Amino acid sequence: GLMQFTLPVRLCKEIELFHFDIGPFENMWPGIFVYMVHRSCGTSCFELEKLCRFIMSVKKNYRRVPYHNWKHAVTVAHCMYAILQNNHTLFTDLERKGLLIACLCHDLDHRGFSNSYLQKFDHPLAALYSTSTMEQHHFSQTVSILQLEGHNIFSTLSSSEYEQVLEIIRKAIIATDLALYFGNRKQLEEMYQTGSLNLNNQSHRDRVIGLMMTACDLCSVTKLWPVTKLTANDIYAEFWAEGDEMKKLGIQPIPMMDRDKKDEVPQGQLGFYNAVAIPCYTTLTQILPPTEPLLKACRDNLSQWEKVIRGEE
């Protein structure tokens, strides 16, 4: 109970900032996550023995893929930590518990392929889950890990609190399906602009948590330029392998996934920033003003991609 996690001074300071990079030392990531739970939730939120065993089983069920890996899980949990810490009083005790765990688990057992590739391959998961294929699988994997003996970090919640938190995690993980993001953000945009947005309305909270999950999930575009640029190489490493696999099914992949169209990456990044990233962090900043640093960093990275096109790098 009196056992705190502590970080070295530079990490202790920088971990509070939206643009923190968790570093290349894999063995420090579990402790970083526990540090974040203890500060965001409390030292009492979870039995440390059960949390440590949950974390290590989650780690084991992430695969050795270039992007959708254990580092992505902890990175997305850190962005959620920064949001929750800059919006102290807006979230219930159950939501702070649920969302950090949701972020750590949101890409469990990812194979480095999109929902589209699974459907075109006719993968068994595509028959089990017709929409949000991987995301329903990620939630399924999360529930399976929670039910391993000694892994139930929610054991001290009442029956209804346990049902509520699993509901927060399910919706949070499903919201990471980017196909759902576009409609969710437009609805939140209308609601904010007409003034109907009401954080005591559960369906409204659900929408706001959804956008928060998208924002944490995309947080690669909100880091310092050298982290953004080097993370993009990992994302394209997965996309181009998927494109290769599309070519093996006799389907020309979209340019985004075709390694022969590397040259078009800078202009493709502009599209992404303008169509997905900037809108996401703009609506988030309207609803949760203290998340403005994410929007600012995102605009800084758009400007860096514009400089890449203009041959200035």
- Which residues are known binding-site members for 3',5'-cyclic GMP? 68, 269
The span of 47-55, 73-81, 134-142, 260-268 binding ligand JP0 (CB under 6 A) equals 260-268
Burial track 153-166 (b if 16+ CB lie within 10 A, e otherwise): bbeebeeeebebbb
Distance CA 241, CA 236 (A): 8
Residues flagged as binding site: 68, 72, 106-107, 217, 269
The residue within the footprint of ligand JP0, chosen from 94, 180, 265, 278 (CB under 6 A), is 265
Distance CA 247, CA 259 (A): 11
Whether the Cβ atoms of residue 240 and residue 258 lie closer than 8 Å to each other: yes
Q: Which residue is nearest to Zn ion (CB)?
A: 107
The span of 40-48, 118-126, 154-162, 272-280 binding ligand JP0 (CB under 6 A) equals 272-280
Residue 89 CB, nearest approach to ligand JP0 (Å) = 32
Name the DSSP class of 277.
I
- Applying the rule CB under 6 A, the residues between 193 and 232 that interact with ligand JP0 are 220-221, 232
Q: In terms of CB distance, is 40 or 220 closer to ligand JP0?
A: 220
The residue within the footprint of Zn ion, chosen from 95, 109, 177, 217 (CB under 5 A), is 217
Q: In terms of CB distance, is 210 or 268 closer to ligand JP0?
A: 268
Q: How many CB atoms are closer than 10 A to CB 198?
A: 11
225 binds, among Mg ion, ligand JP0, Zn ion, none (CB under 5 to 8 A by kind): none
Regarding 133 and contact with Mg ion (CB under 5 A), the answer is: no
Task: Answer yes or no: 19 catalytic.
Answer: no
Radius of gyration in angstroms for the set of CA atoms belonging to the chain, rounded to a whole number? 19
Distance CA 69, CA 73 (A): 7
Per-residue interface string for the shown chain with Mg ion, residues 153-192, x marking contact by CB under 5 A: -----------------------x----------------
Token output for 302: 């758009």
The span of 100-108, 111-119, 270-278, 287-295 binding Mg ion (CB under 5 A) equals 100-108
Regarding 42 and contact with ligand JP0 (CB under 6 A), the answer is: no
Catalytic residue among 68, 110, 137, 151: 68
Distance CA 62, CA 119 (A): 21
Whether the Cβ atoms of residue 147 and residue 246 lie closer than 8 Å to each other: no
Distance CA 257, CA 91 (A): 38
The span of 70-78, 100-108, 270-278, 305-313 binding ligand JP0 (CB under 6 A) equals 270-278
Distance CA 107, CA 142 (A): 10
| Burial of residue 280, with CB atoms counted within 10 A of its CB: 0-12 exposed, 13-18 middle, 19 or more buried | buried
Residue ranges in contact with ligand JP0 by CB under 6 A: 220-221, 232, 235-236, 255-256, 261, 264-265, 268-269, 271-272, 275-276
Active site residues: 68
